[PDB]
Every structure is written in C-alpha cells, then in structure tokens.
Enzyme design. Structure first.
Site, PDB file in Angstrom:
ATOM      1  N   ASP C  72      64.476  18.441   2.886  1.00 24.29           N
ATOM      2  CA  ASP C  72      64.009  19.688   3.477  1.00 24.29           C
ATOM      3  C   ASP C  72      64.438  19.991   4.903  1.00 24.29           C
ATOM      4  O   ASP C  72      65.131  19.197   5.545  1.00 24.29           O
ATOM      5  CB  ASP C  72      62.481  19.717   3.417  1.00 24.29           C
ATOM      6  N   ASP C 141      48.166  13.630  -1.573  1.00 24.00           N
ATOM      7  CA  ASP C 141      47.695  14.186  -2.835  1.00 24.00           C
ATOM      8  C   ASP C 141      48.741  14.002  -3.929  1.00 24.00           C
ATOM      9  O   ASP C 141      48.689  14.676  -4.958  1.00 24.00           O
ATOM     10  CB  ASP C 141      47.364  15.674  -2.687  1.00 24.00           C
ATOM     11  N   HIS C 143      51.825  14.837  -3.879  1.00 25.73           N
ATOM     12  CA  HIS C 143      52.880  15.850  -3.884  1.00 25.73           C
ATOM     13  C   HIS C 143      54.199  15.306  -3.339  1.00 25.73           C
ATOM     14  O   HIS C 143      54.226  14.315  -2.602  1.00 25.73           O
ATOM     15  CB  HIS C 143      52.428  17.094  -3.103  1.00 25.73           C
ATOM     16  N   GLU C 148      54.059  21.873  -3.781  1.00 26.00           N
ATOM     17  CA  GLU C 148      52.605  21.792  -3.817  1.00 26.00           C
ATOM     18  C   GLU C 148      52.127  21.135  -5.095  1.00 26.00           C
ATOM     19  O   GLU C 148      52.898  20.976  -6.037  1.00 26.00           O
ATOM     20  CB  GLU C 148      51.982  23.191  -3.685  1.00 26.00           C
TER      21      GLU C 148
END
Lengths: 266, 266, 266, 266, 266, 266
Positions: C72, C141, C143, C148
């Site tokens: 990213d 979480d 991810h 997401e």
C-alpha cells in the site's frame, strides 16, 4: 461480502432493483453481448420486481438485451397454471417490460426427459458464457433454491423432491392445500448459482435471521449453504430490519456505517 | 456431501464396494480410457475389499481396465514383508481380482531417491489425467492418509515422519512392537486426494465420532482436514453406528431419511 | 499452514528474512526470470528488513534480480514525505540493498487517476506472472493490508478510506497527530495477496493474539480475513511469544515440536 | 438430573404418573402429614393426568391426603369458564379422583387484590412447609410457567402480561381467537418451583428440542430458565422421541442405557 | 477458585501435602475439636501421601487429632484384600502416621445393609459437623468419585454400579483382569464433597486436560461435575504440566503469575 | 435479572438514582431501621451521584437514615488526599446530602492491622444485618470491585495488589502517573456483594460490551464474575448504548420492549 441493511421490504426492493438497473446500464448490453440475469420467484422478490417495473416505465432501463435464467420450476404443473414459476414471472415482471421471448429462460417442468432438460439448461447458460448477476433468496436453514442443506457447492440443475416444509409453505398458493402442491421441482444447483459473476440475496423477515447470521457472522460450512457465499468473489445480502435479529449489535452497526452512502434514496 | 449412515462395518463395506462397482460399470472403462481408483489400506477398508472381491467373483465387475493408485507405503520396508502396504493390497484385493500389474500403482518405499519417487507418482496420476474415485479413511483427528493436521489443502505426495500415535496403533501389525514399526512413510497429499473427481471416506468406530462430526456438522477448518471435504464437489461419508456418537440426533435422522432408498440391500 | 512460534521480534525477523533469502537463492533469479517479492511496511516488518539487510551485507543474497511489489501507499502524501510508504521502504530496505529501481513497484498515492493507477498495479503484477512470496502482517481484527473485514477474498488493488482506528494508530508517525494522518490509501486486495504463490504473515504482540488464533485454530470465515489463509496452498505464520496468548497450550506445543528443527539459529 | 427418554407422550404420561404414585405411596400421607403436589395444565400433562386417573381407578393411589398447588390461572376469567385452569384441572383430574376440596389450591384470577392473592398463595405453601414434587412443562425458550426468560431464579407468584406468542398458542382454546384469550395471568415464580423438593418436567414434541438440550447438555444460564434445574437437588426430565432432536446421539444413548431398568412397563 | 500450576506429580504431591499440613497446624486440632480430612485413593494421590508421610516423619505434622473420611470403597471385597481402598489407605498413609483408629472413617463395602451403611457414613460426618478439607481427583469426564456425569450437585453417599471404563482402568490392580474387578462400589456424593469447607482436586496427566479446562475455563454445567466447583466457596486445582494442554496459553500464564509466590519450594 | 437499556450515561445516572430514591422512600428508613446502601467510586457512578444530589435538593430524598458501605479504598493513601475513595465520596456525594457521619462506612486504607480492618468491615455490615441495595460497576473482564477473575463467589473484604491495568487506568487521577498510583487496595468480596438484597451494576462504554454480554447472554462461569449475578435473586444492569455492542439485536430488543414503561423520564 456486502450487507445492505434496510428497514423495509419496499426499500430492499428499491435497492435491489436499482442495483440491477445500474449493473445493466453500466454493462450496456447489445444483441451480441447481452446482460444475463439470474432470477428467483416467490414473495421475497416481490418488491424488487415491482421496483424494476417502475424504473423501466420511468424509462431508466430496457431489458431488450437482457437474457434471464430462472432458478426453478414445478415438475408436471402446466405452464399456464397461475402458480407455475413461468406464470409468476410473466405476471410480476415480463408482462410489464421489453424483454424478448427468446431472452427468457425458464426450466420446463413438463419436459419428457427431465435429465436432458436440466442438462440443456446448464448448456444454454454456458452458451452465453456466464450469468452477470444472479438474484435469489435464502431458506430459513440457509439453503439455496430447492437445493437441500449439505448440497455440494458444485451441484447443478436437477430435479428435487420437495420437502414437507416447502409444501406447507407453498400450499397457500395452491390455496392452502398442501395436497395440491406438486411433488417435484427442477432447480439450478449451488454450483450454477456460484458461477454467477455477482450474487445478490434478498433477506426478508425475522425467520431468515439465523440464515442471515450464518451468512454474515458464522463460519463457512455446508449445512448452511448461504455461508459459502463468503467464499464467492462478489456477494451482497440486502435485508430488512426483522431479519437482523440474530446479528450482534456491532455487526449491524458496522455495515450500517460502511454502507450509509449507498442506502440513501434506494 | 453425502452421509451414508449404516449399522455395521460389513454394511459399510457392501455399500462402498457396490458404489465403486456401479461407478465402474457406468464408466465402462477401456484400454484407452481406464477407470482410475484411489485406494487405502488398513482395517477400515477390510469389509469393502472383501465385498469388492465377492462382487467380482459373482461376475459383477472386472478390474481389467481399472488403474489404481494407493495412498501410501512404508519407507525402507521390503515390498514382500507381509506388513508393507503392497502386501496388504495383494493379499486383500489384487490376488483375487483381474487387474493387470501395469494398472497397479503403489509408492516405492525403497526408491533410492524419495523426492523423485513422490514426484513421479504425482506425474503418473496426471498422465492418466484424474482419479475418478478416491476411497480413504480418516484419522481420529480428521487427518487424511499420513498428512498431519493443518496440512495445506494443496499438499502433494511426500515422505512423512510417522507420529508416535501412528506407531503404537500400527505396532500391532509389527506384532505389538512399536519398535518394529518403520519410522517414515510415503503418502499422497491432501491436494492429491481433493483432485479426485469423487472422494469416499469410510468411517468406522466410535473413535472416529469427533472426526465424522467435524466433517458433517462442523465448519471448514484446516486443523480437521476432513472438514474441507465440505468444499469438494463430490464427497461421501460411509459410516457405521458407533461413529455417529457425536452427531445431533436430528442430523443423523436427516441423512437416514434422505438416503433411505440408497441403503436397502447394500 | 505453517506456524513458526518464536520468542522475540528479533527472532521472527531473522527467521522471516532467512526464509526469503532461501527462497531466492533456490529460485536463482535472472534478468528474464526474476524473483517477485510482496512487501509490507510498518513496525512489524522492522526486524525482518534489518535481518535481510544484514544477510545481504554478509553477502548471502543479492536483490539484483528481485522485483518487489508493496501492499500500500497513502493517497495525496508526497513521495519524499518521510512517512510515505515509499520513504519507509527506501530508508529501511532499498537504501541498503542492490535492487534496481525498475524492479521496485510501489503504488502512486499521487496518481491523477486513482482507478487507473490501481488497475495498472494489478497489470504490472500479471505481466510478471505471479508473486512468489508475499510477506505481510495482520490487523488486530484479522484484516489484511487496508482491506476491511468481510472483504471479498477476491478483492483487488483499490483506494480505501482509512478507519479512525488506523488513523490513531498511525497518528504517532504524523507525530501523534491523528489530524495529520492522510484520509485515504491505496491497497492491494485480498485476491492480490492470495494469488501469491506463498504467503508469509508476521505476527507480533499480544494484540494480535485473537487474530493468530482465528488464523490457526478458528474456522474459515470472512470477518477474520486472515482465517482464509487456511485455504491457501502455501501459508506461514511467523510469530512471537506474546501473540500466542489465545492459542491452546497443546496447539502451541504441536507447532513448537513440529517446527523445532526449523527454528534453531533463525 | 435424570432424563427419562421414552418414545411417546402416552409413555411419558404413564411414567410420570407412576413416579407420582410411587412417591405418594412411599410417603404414606396422612391428615396431619399430606403429600404436597405441584401441578401444570395444558396439552403436555394430558397423558399423565389420564394415567394418574387410571391408576387411581385401579386402586393404586388415593389423593385423600394429597394437597395440590397449581402453577397458574388466567386473570379476570370466570372460574367456570371451560378454559380457566380451574376448569381444566377438574375436568381432567379432580373430577375423577378422591382429593378433598380443601386440599386443592389454585390461584384466584378474580381476586380483587392480586398482590394479596399471590402473596397468600406463597403463604399457603409455606404453611404446609414444602412441595414434595412439582410437575411442570417447559416453554420452547426454556421458560417456566408464565415466567419470562431471564426471570430471577428466586422469583415468586405474581401476575404476568401474557406474550403474543402465548396468546396465539392458546387462542386455539378460546377457539382460535387470539382476541378472546385473556391479557394477564397469575403464575408461581421460579423460586416457588425450585423450592420444591423434587421437580419433574414433561417434555413433548420437537419444538421443545432446543429447551431439552439447554436443560441437559447446555451450561447453566438464566436466558434458558430450564437450564438452572441443573443446580436443583432433584430434577427429572421425562421426554418423548421428537423432543430429543437437538441432543447428541451419545447423550441420548447415555441416559437410555442408564435408565433402561426404569422405563420397562411405564 | 485457585489453580496451582506445577510441572510434576512429585511437585503436586509436595504442594498438596504442604497445604494440608498448613491447614492442620493453623487449625490446631484437639481431642474435642479435630481437623476432619476427606481423602481419595488411586494413583493420583500417591505423591501427596508420600509427601504427607515425609513431613510427618520430619516432625511437621501429627494426625493424632485428625479425623479422616474416605470417598469410596469396593462392595463385597474383603477389607484385607490388598486392592480394597482400606488396604490402599493403610499401606500408603495410615501405616506411617500417628492417626488413631477411631479417627479413620472408611465405607464398609461388606456391610449387610448397604443403604444403612451409606446413611450412617453421612451421619458420622454430620456428627463432627463438617469436613474442613476434602481432597480428591477428577475423572476424564469431570466426574467426581464414583458419581456419574449429571449427578445431582446434592447427591449423597450411595452404592454405584461401576462403569466398564472404570473396570478396565482398575483391572490392572486386579492384575489386568477386568473380570476380577468388583461390580459395585460405595461412594460419597457430590453434595457430600461440596459441603466440605475447602475442596482440593489433584489433576495429573494429559487425559485430565479436558476436565481441567471444564473446571477452570468452561461454564458451570452438570455434565462436567468438576465445573460446579466454580460455585464452591473454597476450591483449589493442583495440577501438573500435561494436564494443562487444553487451557489457553494466557489462562495458564494468569495463574502461573498469580500463584508464583505460593509455588516456590512445594 | 433486569437490563435497563438507555442511551446515555446521564440517563443511566438518572435511572439508577431514581431507583435508589424509590427503594429508600418505599422502605421508609428510621433511626432503628436504616436503609443500607452499597456504593462504588469512579467515573461510572458519576452521573448517578449527580442525579441523587439533584433529587435530594429537589426534596425527593433524605439520607438522614441511610447507612452506606463503600466497595473499596487505597491502602496507605492519606484520607484527605484528593484521590482517596473517601475524598471522591464526600466531594461527589456526602458534601451535598444530609447523611450523618456515623452512617458512612468506608474502609481504612491506613488501618495498622489490615486483616482486622477488613474483618471489622464485614462485622459492621452484619451488625446492620444486610445491605438492601449494592450499586457497583464492572471491569472490562467482568470482575467486581478489586476482586480478580475466578474469585470465589464467596470471597470477603480483603486487601488486593492492584493490577498493572488498574494502575494505568487510574494513573490519570494520580495525574497520568502510574508511578504515583498506590500498590494495594482494600476491597469488599464477591460474597459481600452477593449478600446484598439487590445488586445494581452500572455499565457504561463500549469497553464493557463483552462484560455486559457475559452478564446477560453468556453462561454462568467464574472467569467473568459478573455472569454469576444471573444466580442472584435481584440483579439489575443499567447500561448505555455503546455498552450494548456485543449483544444480539434481538436480546436488546427484548429488554427494550420489556422495560419500555420503566425508562420514560429517567
């Protein structure tokens, strides 16, 4: 996966219909490159077909180059019987839009050779290549179309012996007579459904709560077929408020916040 | 997935054997198009091999054009040792049927170059194209062949260091001597197994109860390899009564009702 | 899946770095056949980049024919801003190794046409064919990258609106100012990640405990993206001690025994 | 806890009735030391009252010195209305046995002061000291009498506003009119029930499956009141086959083997 | 509850023994106020009895005013048979300490009237008032003494028909003959155990892992009797390393840190 | 149990305060029969104390005959230090109401003999007989007061070594200095709390979500002390919106409908 949490069935229909319309207009189908649409029957798709018709009359969509394939049909029930899926589809959708008859695909519950009928349905689809958007509903046990729980995620169009529960639930259309309701039906398989480029399930009513939960929060497992849509490249769950009863408050808050921009208007 | 709930191991064997026989006769194998069969060894497949032999002697099947591939073999154990998988296979199956030697594929636990041996086994399979029906059993922890839990669902034929538990469990054949039992074995991978067109697992005994439950009711997860068969296009679990101890009463009632027609006779 | 349970972040880095080095030397990349490496930024990959640099200076690896693709980049942040991913990558890795500039692929957070930028990133990858080893981390979480939870396991490079939690967590680099932190970022998709031939996730800290558990012991489910790596052909989890807090004592003992030979030295 | 797994409702009734009869004959009640019996109304206790009457006519029991306390009554419904609990009790039990009127305790749904009525019911019980055997049924959600889920395990006799579900379910007796069904009812509390020396719950029908499972296999929790009977000193669950659908095959096999001697005859 | 996580059985014994010794010395028992001790037999209590004897010989405790009550005894096995619980107790404990014979309470597996025998055992205990510390072990299924799973948490001393599993497991003492092992046994109830002021369970071996987990991490439920000790005012679990296999890494780290001061020395 | 689902902390405070006021006015305390109130300190009880003061100034309650007992106090911190619980209580409550000093009970963190101090606190309570309403909060892990998870549900007032987490969380009052925060504290036990006739827990903030869920939906277990309030005769959970994140949508809808009449006004 996407979860569009709306309040009413009317909203779900408007949202689902708008999504289909948008997918179509963006695809810009032609005679040589039609937009292929998978479709369900029953009370669930009601508001969507109603919205689709409105948008069409409003001049927002043309189904001139849309090819449709329906999920199922009753075996041995005459096409013009008002309770055949063919009849439901024309009365609720085809009678009000500009789709050509050659673009409408429905299983022949009266074909002399059933296996051949199913085989050919699968072949007709492949001839087009792929279904761009398959819309459907889900059983209270997460099952898809007439496929039973634990169906192979690779199953195909075939005939099925309707379950007592399905009978009673539909006996109402054969005017509360479960005795009237046909014994078998022809249904697309789970593989058929999953091969669709995009799958959109309409979830309405508190009785779908457990299935919505299995689809969104549960783990992938074959007893709840709907849960395997988690593995699908492009799945959307469009639901009403009552169907959200089994989700955690935060799960619903998550999607309600994540999709806030997409649910204004409908 | 399919779950054939039977009462005894004798029934499981008859059912499994009949299914193989039927698959073969329907395929109608030839010299240029043989039916490829994946096979397991051990106490579990016992009644099936016994049933297969009976049906053959009864003139119901010929393995003249059936090519078989076995799941595993002990490394460094001489082929004619009575406890090699090669010996188990001939004594329990090949010695009583009409399968040609060139159609029998077994891993060479004595190959000088193990990696090459495994590599070639994988190659021999692909040369035929695909295994039409892979029969096997399952570990008490849901593992497949000599693959350990958490194996990649894409693993391939390779050598494995046997686990203490496997040793003891097999020490009985090396006459209760866990010291006798070989240290390593060559085993097909989970990918090898899943590439089979159809997979049929024999589940016998209460000690498989948890694994049967993980396969049928649990969610897909890699710790219990057997559970990933839920994602396979054509999987069947043939089981006896004791193995059903961990299933819900209704789950068993479901399959017992769904498969009632298919279990009469065996 | 593989779980490399180590004690410290320094060990994780040494292990991860050594694995990359080994994969490269075994591949023996050339100008026409380079080794493609997927890479992450942040505090997690810190010790790995540090180890990679050491090994390179020790003359154990050359990145002369290694092509890298980063997960990213911040949208609208100038490349030379010290907090862009481009800056992190050069300062922590590229500035100390022999990789050519044409072999470095990073998303352009400043591209005028974002969709085109993302589209092309996906295209550049396919031009090479496939990523041989994609290294990354995991969210608290489960991810992946800026994807997401509930992302399609087939999602692709696209722009994302950073979450409040991500902001605060990174506000520290924009010197504790969550106000400074950029609003959007460009991120590879989960599909992008899964297409990698091998995926290696670095897990450090007790706050990743739940995610490590979801990845290793939990069932496959889309809410915890990391759990779907269970379905990947070649996934490895390299972790430190604190991150193992949610695993069963036996699960950790299993992998610690299974990988004992592979963790000596680092 | 004890679980008496029987096949039919007729068997459950015979078993339950025989247990009550035995408890009574062994207690050998007198005018100064009566046997106090807690009782339920509805379709569930039907076969038990029928069996109790038979045994009495067969001269196997006398209720001459049995004092009964009923779980509930409709508020504002006249006693002789055929659908009051008072009417159900006499028509189905009292009209056929030798119990004296002073030994029959039923809540007065028409008492001018409800709180006083309830208060006194609790007092009448304590005056006798304790209920020796309280028989009852269980709601589909594990609730007891008209107590709602999450009731204090120490709740007492009080008035309750009937739930929509209870209404519909009983509308049939007010001849399918849910409009007829009374709005409130007086019910003993969970504390009242638990203070009984022995508690015996009749479980009939597949719709009780989840509750039976919560009672027998689940953990103690207040949402499923029935589960707290696990903490009671002397609880028995007498059930039919359909109600066992949610239990593990082994759980049912356990009790079926453990209670084999006690279920022959009924 | 307290969880004393130790490494070996020798440590568990030393810890358990020291705790008993400390409780006794702090109580300072007299002829009119003795310290009442509940005791178990079997391989588990072995190291504890060994440690208790050492401490006594070291002059750290006197059992001159300690009254003991044992959990069980075989029915119909002569007291001096070397495999009766009476024999195990004297050979392993009483033969080496200063406890008077009148202070030793053991069930009479040969009492002519069993119910009376059990009844009196319960009475002897109450005559003393209460057991100050009841030490025991736990079954692989969480059961206590010879009580079966789902026993009333209020059960009392009674005779039990030994289970096949118990037989085999003890057949070794009746020299591997499961045929030798007695059919019934007299056992204290769960109520008997819970009435103890303090309860200390010895947990040794990986086969107790699930039970330790049910006791420490699971929810209160009657199928795993041990789990109800969570409701007891003063319960302690003293365990070895293998028994911790089913606990989360953090759970074990919690108690290991919380009880670090108390486990040095043993 | 009761669950009062409100939106804000201000509402929770108003509701909690009104409940206390009502309980008091209905009890009508005198000099010989005072209303005993258990109280907590911290940010959670803030709005309640604020509401209580308002109602008092509005002339709706007098604490002239209310005796209070506080849950805890810091050991070794001087009473007039502004951060002692004594200081918090006077500044936030006692300074604005008519409660006599002899009616205020607070633990003496400076007592020379701590055990005696705690012992006497327990004695002072019993002298009054029982606490009529104990108000408190809950830890993020479901713990009560300074009691740690897995505390005996029968524990009593005692000194505790504060946990690192508690330190940091309170370091803010010792002006962000975790170094300032005292090392030990005196706290009432869980038994102390459960002996209260009625227990009311204030739940505010999303960080309590898991604990609220363990209390309301989970099963009874000692790791989450709050869950055992399910066994208490009269427990109420008063919560704000954020704290409901982990509850099912239907669970919250249940209580919101069941308590609609009781939450209007506040």
């Amino acid at each position: 996966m996407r979860l569009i949490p709306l309040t009413t069935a009317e909203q779900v229909g408007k949202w689902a219909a708008r999504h289909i319309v948008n997918r179509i207009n963006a695809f810009k189908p032609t005679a040589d490159r039609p937009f292929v649409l998978g479709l369900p029957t029953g009370g669930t798709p009601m508001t969507t077909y109603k919205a689709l018709v409105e948008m069409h009359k409003a001049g927002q969509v043309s189904f001139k180059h849309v090819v449709t394939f329906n999920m199922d049909e009753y075996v041995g029930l005459p096409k013009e019987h008002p309770e055949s899926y063919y009849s439901f589809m024309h009365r609720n959708f085809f009678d009000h839009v500009d789709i050509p008859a050659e673009n409408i695909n429905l299983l022949n519950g009266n074909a002399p050779d059933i296996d051949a009928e199913c085989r050919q349905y699968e072949e007709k689809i492949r001839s087009y290549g792929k279904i761009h958007l398959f819309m459907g509903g889900v059983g209270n046990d997460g099952h898809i179309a007439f496929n039973e729980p634990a169906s192979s995620l690779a199953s195909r169009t075939r005939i099925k012996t309707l379950t007592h529960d399905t009978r009673v639930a539909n006996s109402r259309f054969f005017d509360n007579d479960v005795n009237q309701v046909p014994k078998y039906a022809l249904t697309v398989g789970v593989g058929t459904l999953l091969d669709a480029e995009e799958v959109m399930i309409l979830v309405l009513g508190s009785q779908k709560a457990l299935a919505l939960q299995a689809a969104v929060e549960g783990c992938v497992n074959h007893m709840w077929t709907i849960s395997c849509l988690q593995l699908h490249p492009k799945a959307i769950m469009v639901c009403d408020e009552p169907s959200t009863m089994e989700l955690k408050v935060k799960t619903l808050r998550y999607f309600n916040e994540l999709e806030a921009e997409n649910i204004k208007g409908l």
